[PDB]
Amino acid sequence: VPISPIETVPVKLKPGMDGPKVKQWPLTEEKIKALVEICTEMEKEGKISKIGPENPYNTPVFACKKKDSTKWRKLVDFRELNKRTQDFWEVQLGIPHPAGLKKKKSVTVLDVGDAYFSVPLDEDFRKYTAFTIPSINNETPGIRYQYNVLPQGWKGSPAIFQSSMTKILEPFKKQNPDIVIYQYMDDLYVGSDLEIGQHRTKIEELRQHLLRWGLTTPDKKHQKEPPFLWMGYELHPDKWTVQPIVLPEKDSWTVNDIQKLVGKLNWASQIYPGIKVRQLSKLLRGTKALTEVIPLTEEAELELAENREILKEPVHGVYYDPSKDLIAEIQKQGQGQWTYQIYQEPFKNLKTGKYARMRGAHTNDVKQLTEAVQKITTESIVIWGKTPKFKLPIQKETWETWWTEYWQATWIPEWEFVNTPPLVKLWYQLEKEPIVGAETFYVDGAANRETKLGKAGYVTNKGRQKVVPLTNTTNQKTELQAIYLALQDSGLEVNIVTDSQYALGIIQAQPDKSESELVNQIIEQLIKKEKVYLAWVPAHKGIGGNEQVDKLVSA
Amino acid sequence: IETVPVKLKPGMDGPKVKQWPLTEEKIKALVEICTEMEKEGKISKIGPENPYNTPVFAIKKKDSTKWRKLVDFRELNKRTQDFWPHPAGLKKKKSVTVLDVGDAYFSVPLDEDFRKYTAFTIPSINNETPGIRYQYNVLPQGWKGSPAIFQSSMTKILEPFKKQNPDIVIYQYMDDLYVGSDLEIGQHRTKIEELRQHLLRWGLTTPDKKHQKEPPFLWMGYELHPDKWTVQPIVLPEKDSWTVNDIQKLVGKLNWASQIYPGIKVRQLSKLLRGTKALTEVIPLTEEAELELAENREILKEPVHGVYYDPSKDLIAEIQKQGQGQWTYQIYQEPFKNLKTGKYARMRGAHTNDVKQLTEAVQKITTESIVIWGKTPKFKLPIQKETWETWWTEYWQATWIPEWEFVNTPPLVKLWYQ
DNA sequence: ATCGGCGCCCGAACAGGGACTGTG
DNA sequence: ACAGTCCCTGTTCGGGCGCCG
Ligand SMILES: OC[C@H]1O[C@@](CO)(O[C@H]2O[C@H](CO)[C@@H](O)[C@H](O)[C@H]2O)[C@@H](O)[C@@H]1O
């Protein structure tokens, strides 16, 4: 199968650059005879041409085993050429998911053999792919070659082959507008609604069409029967599942090992409902030593046990039905952790997932729930091209008082309430008017910019005062610390007057969790109270108790 | 017709903006549009060897079912070269109508050395196929350079109608033609059809509005009335009895308003809170404090003097969510030197969709900035970045896109709406 | 050791902007 | 008026998972 008659993609170097001139590093003898045998072979196949001293460029070459294969993959350390090659706009915008596949009568999975080695390379650019094979005898100079096809390891090869494959399939796709072809690199998911007999006729038309364009479809890579191994999934006729996940078992773990376990748990969370990785990812904080050994914490081990528990049972996904509505339901599992399932028929999930991002230093469950709703919305647009209907564990009245009372514009699409505890609630609520018969606290705090030492205190209308000295603190922390004092030394109903927009803006957002230990203490006090009114006055304006407490803490 | 040479500003590359996900409704509409533009030679397919990209998406036209392809040419326009009088009476006209003449640009070819920068990529659902990339061969809608290159042809097309109707103000901004007159609403709508047919002798206009008697809120960006735009004054509460808390809110409001109004004084009001009183304690206003408040009421009622527009400085607009579907906004160039303070209320998605409201308010604020000054302001949006980027395309219907940033404002700005 | 391109997650360095404070 | 410190958000790059040559 000669090289593809497709037009070469024009490739340039970065402006004002030349090609790579890197010397060849030593190679082992097992690989030298294999590269020589391979290079003379892939010269016979036309992929490679011999070059002379006129070519002043070079790139080091080696040869590794092909992925899960007895064939050798010829790889080149084109790190120097990639820096000098023009940038491309990658056309691969994402990864196809089986949950977005519709039901089809006939399914075929193809794979093009020697994909990159079938597409020619721009003739003017071939000079820069020059490389030298050092011989065994150091006295021999070594054989120089250049590439005639897309080399493996070049930054432009994936995009050019992807672009080239689309041009090859365009005529066939037009000749068969009703045949669905999911195209990712060299793997071809072909689906039609024809009968099984007439479908193999069109597949052969497709294989012959690709063969005319220099794209062979080997029988070793031709799948004709479900189950289908496609994009790391197992595609049964009416259900889909993930290829076997292998979690490592070790007595002691390292940073790298934790990093692999978190990743595989994320890859599993697309269909396994309930995966948690918050406590396992916490072990990756601070330690940049990849081979450092980490003892599993009590919370981390519990998380690993939970994941293995739901991984021992097999889970399957369903395909997409364009006629039926898309539904997603979210549940609050842990603090800051969420899991969701997208389905059409109950208990027949298309896919699952999780959102466990802490957005901001201070937040609440309603914010995180709205952040997770948006992540699902975007993910749903990619897979199914439409926004799903929502089933959320938050009261209709809970959300109404939040979005109407919140200063930012927040919205959630069409959703219905489901009574699946734990529900999302506002743990406390600030009064809109000052409380009658509630002790009024005028709080403030200060800190020195050089000394980092500060004070924080309050004065009340009942004459009560307090000032606490603080060490290693800031201005922002002392104003929060002053509000904490007023909440501590008050009854169940208190009026607090601060001059810190920073402290006011944090509390007014009704957070229930915070990266700051002090704010979490303030949150804990606010939930214990029965009525709290927080008011703001401008500092340094001779206003009420603000002036009395200002002189107490600035000294 | 030979193409006009276009360069980028010195030392700047083309735009490289990723394409954001689109709905099947929008993708199927875009593929049909781009395939027709390729047949008529208006665009052409390109490959990954073009390293530039600009996001594309589709919107449903104003009071119509047809789709309009909208390019987010914000990045290309910042990096595009600059080319080479604003009608002050357009904002004084009774009725002003916006006509989409962006279709006229598709008749002028674009400079070959420049077409590489107009590349965009159409995505596919579930990443079935790679992105199909196109570039423009003619003047594109939404490009900063398109109205400038076409300016010579536009003055020529409009001159007979403008001399035949000298009382009609006609301003052009990007794809839109702003047509203002003082005629009655019915005679005004007839004059718009006279201009459309006069334009039709050369270049086509967006399909006739299916409704001709102005349904409610379908003509938001279509039929606008500038002579009825009102500014939102700063107001102070009027109470028979004042508490310590009520005076503190008043003093804090007046001290903030003193940054916009010079003569605001709060000393006699602050004297009323000199103790360490309870927030709910009623405080009688002294004779000195009552006078200080009444003069401040006069100052907040009087307009600000000495605030003029600077054509060299960018415009900035800030919006505040006031609740109950009401949104306050201010347009300025220097802090506390507002060129206009307005209020928009009761917008679409009543008491359900906050985002639909904000998206409409941004468009309404932008329309005013184009009508009044001929610029677009940079918006400080009171919304989360992901909340806005997820939904804003679903409610956008303008041919332009203003620059924006996202801010988390503390809700102590009760100082703009009562 | 020793590769390309894409997407996702989680963690952290860096930068940008706004407000407060101290100072000429 | 200018210069810092703090805090906060956002972007970018690194690890990992997964896909494919
Ligand atoms: O909305 C932020 C978002 O905008 C992007 C792409 O949409 O950049 C474009 O939009 C900005 C919004 O103002 C413009 O400033 C910018 O010029 C334009 O390219 C991304 O930067 C960002 O994700």
A380 CA to D18 C1' in angstroms comes to 19
Q: Please report which residue ranges of A277-348 form alpha helices under DSSP H.
A: 278-282, 298-311
The type of residue at B327 is W
Helix (H) or strand (E) holding A504: helix A501-508
The type of residue at A350 is L
Q: Say yes or no for a CB contact (<8 Å) between B384 and A408.
A: yes
User: Beta-carbon neighbour count of residue B351 at 10 Å?
Assistant: 12
User: Which residues in 508-527 of chain A line strand D, with CB less than 7 A from it?
Assistant: 516
A274 CA to C1 C1' in angstroms comes to 39
Distance, in Å, from the CA atom of A63 to the CA atom of A66, rounded to the nearest integer, reads 9
Answer whether A456's CB lies under 8 Å from A367's CB.
no
Could you state, in order of their start, the residue ranges of all structural domains in chain B? Answer: 5-88+114-154, 89-113+155-223, 224-309, 310-416
Could you state, in order of their start, the residue ranges of all structural domains in chain A? Answer: 1-91+117-157, 92-116+158-226, 227-320, 321-427, 428-555
Q: Say yes or no for a CB contact (<8 Å) between B126 and A101.
A: yes
Angle at which helices B185-200 and B151-164 pack, to 10 degrees? 130
Best probe of the B interface among A7, A88, A91, by most B CBs < 10 A, is A91
Q: Does A90 touch chain B (CB under 8 A)?
A: yes
The type of residue at A232 is G
Distance, in Å, from the CA atom of A195 to the CA atom of A210, rounded to the nearest integer, reads 22
Answer whether B294's CB lies under 8 Å from A376's CB.
no
Residue environment code for A30-43, b if the CB has 16+ CB neighbours within 10 A, otherwise e: ebbeebeebbeebe
> DSSP state, A273?
T
Answer whether B67's CB lies under 8 Å from B78's CB.
no
* Nucleotide closest to residue A26 (CA–C1'): C1
B366 C-alpha to ligand 1 centroid (Å):
17
> How far lies A137's CA from each of A74, A134, B277, in Å?
22, 8, 98
Q: Which residues of B touch A94 (CB under 8 A)?
A: 127
User: Which residues in 8-27 of chain A line strand C, with CB less than 7 A from it?
Assistant: 25
Which of B17, B22, B79, B120 is the pocket-test mutation for ligand 1 (most atoms within 8 Å of CB)?
Answer: B17
CA atoms in the 13 A half-sphere facing the CB of B75: 19
Contacting residues for B310 by C-beta, under 8 A, at least 6 apart? B333
Torsion of CA A191, A195, A200, A203, to 10 degrees: -30
Best probe of the A interface among B126, B247, B354, B386, by most A CBs < 10 A, is B126
Answer whether A511's CB lies under 8 Å from A519's CB.
yes
User: Which residues in 297-336 of chain A line strand D, with CB less than 7 A from it?
Assistant: none
B55 C-alpha to ligand 1 centroid (Å):
10
A491 CA to D18 C1' in angstroms comes to 56
Answer whether A13's CB lies under 8 Å from A85's CB.
yes
User: Beta-carbon neighbour count of residue B264 at 10 Å?
Assistant: 19
| A112 SS3 class | coil
Distance, in Å, from the CA atom of B177 to the CA atom of B98, rounded to the nearest integer, reads 5
Distance, in Å, from the CA atom of B211 to the CA atom of A34, rounded to the nearest integer, reads 76
Q: Which residue of B has its CA nearest to A169?
A: B129
The type of residue at A109 is V
Answer whether A236's CB lies under 8 Å from A248's CB.
no
A178 annotated among ligand-binding-site residues: no
The phi and psi torsions of A118 (rounded to 5 degrees) equal -100, -25
Answer whether B350's CB lies under 8 Å from B153's CB.
no
Show which of residues 20-79 on chain A sit within 8 Å of chain B, judged by CB atoms: none
Q: Which residue of A has its CA nearest to B275?
A: A544
Distance, in Å, from the CA atom of B396 to the CA atom of B416, rounded to the nearest integer, reads 26
* Angle at CA of residue B108, ends B106 and B110, nearest 5°: 100
A378 CA to C8 C1' in angstroms comes to 13
Answer whether A387's CB lies under 8 Å from B387's CB.
no
Q: Do β-strands B337-345 and B326-334 pair in parallel, antiparallel, or remain unpaired?
A: antiparallel
Closest CA to B251 of A497, A31, A343: A497
> How far lies B39's CA from each of A516, B9, B32, B34, B101, in Å?
60, 32, 11, 9, 21
Three-state secondary structure along chain B?
A: CCCCCCCECCCCCCCECCCCCCCHHHHHHHHHHHHHHHHCCCEEEECCCCCCEECEEEEECCCCCCEEEEECCHHHHHHECCCCCCCCCHHHCCEEEEEECHHHHHHCECCHHHHHHHCEEECCHHHCCCCEEEEECECCCCCCHHHHHCHHHHHHHHHHHHHHCCCCEEEEECCEEEEEECCCHHHHHHHHHHHHHHHHCCCCCCCCCCCCCCCCCCCCCCEECHHHCCCCCCCCCCCCCCEHHHHHHHHHHHHHHCCCCCCCCCHHHHHHHCCCCCCCCECCCCHHHHHHHHHHHHHHHCCCCCCCCCCCCCCEEEEEEEECCEEEEEEEEECCEEEEEEEEECCCCCCCCHHHHHHHHHHHHHHHHHHHCCCCCEEEECECHHHHHHHHHHCCCCCCCCCEEECCCCCCCCCCCC
Answer whether B19's CB lies under 8 Å from B53's CB.
yes
Cis amide leading into A227 (omega within 30): yes
Q: How far is B242 from chain A (nearest CA, A)?
A: 13
> DSSP state, A126?
G
Distance, in Å, from the CA atom of B50 to the CA atom of B15, rounded to the nearest integer, reads 11
Contacting residues for B5 by C-beta, under 8 A, at least 6 apart? B111, B113, B114
Answer whether A35's CB lies under 8 Å from A63's CB.
yes
Which two tokens mark A410?
Answer: 């927040």
Closest approach atom of ligand 1 to CA B15: 19
Distance, in Å, from the CA atom of B61 to the CA atom of B42, rounded to the nearest integer, reads 21
- The distance from CA B249 to its chain's CA centroid, rounded to whole angstroms, is 33
Answer whether A378's CB lies under 8 Å from A401's CB.
no
Q: Which residues of B touch A382 (CB under 8 A)?
A: 21, 125-127
Per DSSP, what are the bridge partners of residue A503?
A: none
Distance, in Å, from the CA atom of A457 to the CA atom of A550, rounded to the nearest integer, reads 9
Angle at which helices A475-488 and A544-554 pack, to 10 degrees? 120
Answer whether A341's CB lies under 8 Å from A352's CB.
yes
* Angle at CA of residue A258, ends A257 and A264, nearest 5°: 90
Cα-trace Rg, chain B: 25
| A249 SS3 class | coil
Which two tokens mark B322?
Answer: 């006031």
Which two tokens mark B268?
Answer: 């006699």
User: Beta-carbon neighbour count of residue B205 at 10 Å?
Assistant: 18
End-to-end alpha-carbon separation of chain B, Å? 59
Answer whether B328's CB lies under 8 Å from B322's CB.
yes
A255: buried, middle or exposed (CB in 10 Å: 19+, 13-18, 0-12)?
middle
> How far lies B104's CA from each of A153, A520, B145, B153, B206, in Å?
46, 60, 13, 10, 10
Answer whether B295's CB lies under 8 Å from B288's CB.
no
Method used to determine the 3D structure: X-ray
Which two tokens mark A434?
Answer: 């000052």
User: Beta-carbon neighbour count of residue A55 at 10 Å?
Assistant: 18
From start to end of A193-284, where are the E strands?
228-230, 233-235, 240-242, 253-254
Answer whether A118's CB lies under 8 Å from A215's CB.
yes
